[PDB]
């Protein structure tokens, strides 16, 4: 199945 894509909120 699919792999969840995430992002750090502070950049």
């Amino acid at each position, epitope marked *: *199945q699919q792999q*969840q*894509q995430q*992002q750090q909120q502070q*950049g």
Partner: antibody
Amino acid sequence: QVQLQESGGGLVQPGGSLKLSCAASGFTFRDYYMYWVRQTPEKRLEWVAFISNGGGSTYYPDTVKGRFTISRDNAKNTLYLQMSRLKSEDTAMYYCARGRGYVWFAYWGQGTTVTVSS
Amino acid sequence: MQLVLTQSSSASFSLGASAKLTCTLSSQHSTYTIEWYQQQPLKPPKYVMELKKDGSHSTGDGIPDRFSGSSSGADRYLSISNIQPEDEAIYICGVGDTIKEQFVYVFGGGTKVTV
């Protein structure tokens, strides 16, 4: 302490338009992604818009894509949501939010209500 | 299949009693990490916790230790022990998928925990 304060809501008509604002404080605004999330009268939550820290990227769900526009003025520490071609279904409490780590909605504002009626 | 979150039905509980809420991910996304949110009357939603497929989780600020999370397959759980009066709220789970082509965020229908 992180603070988000929305404003701009009110009574409007279908086909109309209005622009919401969210004043941010308690953190370095330009370093964070920002969002708009709404809650319908039936209490259902729906993510409405995303904007990257410098305003470079934006994303919207199909329900509002060609009608809503999220923007920000980092110098003013303010987030905006331009709502055009309003639909009755846009009636909801609108919240601005900020994330933490990998969580999108860690901090929420108090909300502003947009009421669309014929 | 689209990313969907299905939540357990709203129920009433007795003070002190225990409760177990369920949020089930669509099969294609059974490994996803979700978020649990709590919304008390006339208040905005509050970040309760980030729950991973392995059961590991991290709660938000002001979240009572009696609040715990676990998982099982596509199921993500929120267990409230020692149900207090301030626990009466709507609990909504959410899941994000920052796909570059198009970001997606889905919220569950919510579970009313009447106490």
